[PDB]
Ligand binder design. Structure first.
Ligand SMILES: CC(C)C1C(=O)n2ncc(C#N)c2N=C1c1cnn(CCN(C)C)c1
Ligand SMILES: [Mn+2]
Ligand SMILES: [Mn+2]
Ligand SMILES: [Mn+2]
Ligand SMILES: [Zn+2]
Length: 452
């Protein structure tokens, strides 16, 4: 027996409200961040054109078994037509019904039954990948000859290709290769194909658009309940919490929302239909499944609101020895170096994060100096491959500074883990720093000036 969570908030902005996506999100944040997810119905006039030949679109399917609490990684060939045909026949055969006459309530109820049952070993398939020449964005991009209809949506703020380059997303300024993160993912779904409970890398927002097809069912949990949900999962599925060698290597799972609700974790649901958006807020857990054959597109993004949470996330990561996707501080400094061309509100928020960064860095350098580290040299960390600049203990990506030691060449620790590097005496250690405090304070003041 399954009891559907309460519905999450649904917004129907006017064209005036809908115009600027970042302003609209900021306005709904008070409501939506209490539920973790929300749904956005664009004005009826807003309808981006979906033109597509299902025979030339091809992708490699991924296979998925559907067992509650079973571990899954978060890491053959179909055309969109053959997949679609496979998907419809599956659902149609499973229920002995036309795919559209099966109620969403029923598919939901059936999903939670089959993932629970040991006897059932339903496997399904799906597509998940970054856009490519074999399978491109569902939104119009610049390239062949576009219709005027297509051209109209080229520059839309809700065209998800545009989010990795809007200034209001601080992830745009990142000049590092983080393709997995800042580029939109494309998802081809069939009935029961499922995304396990997770939050986004670095606690970022995400936004998801269902282009066409049968709906996508979501479950969302507000950011404030994140560790509570983690406690419940740690008690019921500990194998998901054994630490992992690489970032692609995260274990996740399917878990009945009722189980979370039973343990006082607030959960909300929704059915995302074609032409609707779902937005997930920072550190809001979500999961769900598809009702049938469909096509979605999704991307992460980071508003100014997020910057302090961004800093908190990386400290988390340090404590948990989890790898980082990028350096938060390296991003902060990149923005500071372009203060003159920053949006004024952005510059203000960045300045505030940078002040915390600098006083924290000050204290850490005083601490390592009292541990006997005397020698130092400037080091351009941004030039090192990421796997070449992780703290050997906590795996954090170094940028502001690190300690090295001649006794163990090429190894680094962050300044929280000076004691974890070599067993040589302190004078053989070196402080590697990107900037001096004297370098940093003017960078921060440029941001201050820019913000008046
Ligand atoms: C079933 C699949 C096409 C799919 C999907 O439809 N969605 N829709 C939203 C999300 C998210 N977050 C999302 N994520 C999906 C997805 C990716 N990677 N994986 C593999 C591991 N996953 C179960 C967490 C599933
Ligand atoms: Mn099962
Ligand atoms: Mn997600
Ligand atoms: Mn530790
Ligand atoms: Zn460390």
């Amino acid at each position: 027996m399954f009891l559907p969570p309460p519905e999450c908030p649904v917004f129907e902005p006017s064209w005036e409200e809908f115009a600027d996506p970042f302003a609209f999100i900021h306005k709904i944040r008070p409501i939506a961040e209490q539920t973790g997810i929300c749904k956005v119905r664009p004005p009826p006039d807003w309808q981006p054109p979906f033109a597509c030949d299902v025979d030339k679109l091809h992708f490699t399917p991924r296979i998925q078994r559907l067992n509650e609490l079973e571990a899954q990684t978060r890491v053959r060939d179909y055309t969109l037509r053959t997949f679609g045909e496979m998907a419809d026949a599956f659902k149609s055969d499973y229920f002995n019904m036309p795919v559209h006459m099966v109620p969403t309530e029923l598919v939901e109820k059936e999903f939670w039954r089959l993932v629970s049952t040991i006897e059932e070993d339903v496997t399904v398939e799906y597509g998940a990948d970054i856009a490519s020449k074999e399978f491109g964005s569902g939104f119009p991009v610049r390239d062949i000859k576009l219709s005027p209809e297509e051209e109209e949506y080229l520059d839309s703020g809700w065209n998800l290709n545009n989010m990795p380059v809007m200034e209001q997303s601080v992830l745009a300024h990142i000049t590092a290769d983080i393709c997995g993160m800042k580029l939109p993912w494309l998802y081809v779904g069939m009935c029961f194909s499922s995304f396990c409970w997770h939050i986004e890398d670095h606690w970022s927002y995400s936004i998801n658009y269902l282009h066409w097809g049968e709906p996508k069912t979501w479950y969302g949990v507000p950011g404030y309940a994140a560790e509570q949900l983690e406690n419940v999962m740690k008690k019921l599925a500990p194998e998901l919490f054994v630490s992992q060698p690489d970032l692609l290597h995260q274990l996740v799972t399917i878990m009945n929302p009722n189980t979370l609700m039973t343990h006082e974790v607030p959960v909300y649901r929704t059915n995302q239909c074609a032409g609707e958006f779902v937005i997930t807020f920072p550190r809001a857990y979500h999961s769900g499944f598809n009702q049938g054959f469909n096509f979605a597109e999704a991307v992460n993004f980071c508003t100014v609101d997020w910057l302090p949470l961004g800093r908190q996330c990386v400290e988390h990561y340090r404590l948990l020895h989890r790898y980082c996707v990028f350096s938060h501080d390296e991003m902060i400094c990149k923005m500071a170096s372009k203060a003159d061309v920053l949006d004024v509100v952005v510059a203000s928020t960045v300045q505030k994060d940078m002040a915390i960064m600098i006083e924290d860095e000050k204290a850490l350098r005083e601490t390592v100096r009292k541990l006997g580290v005397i020698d130092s040299e400037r080091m351009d960390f941004e030039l090192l491959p990421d796997d070449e600049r992780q703290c050997v203990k906590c795996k954090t990506t170094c940028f502001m500074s690190a300690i090295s030691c001649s006794c163990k060449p090429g190894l680094l620790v962050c300044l929280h883990h000076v004691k974890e590097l070599c067993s040589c005496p302190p004078y053989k250690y070196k402080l590697r720093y990107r900037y001096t405090l004297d370098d940093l304070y003017p960078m921060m003041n440029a941001l201050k000036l820019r913000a008046e």
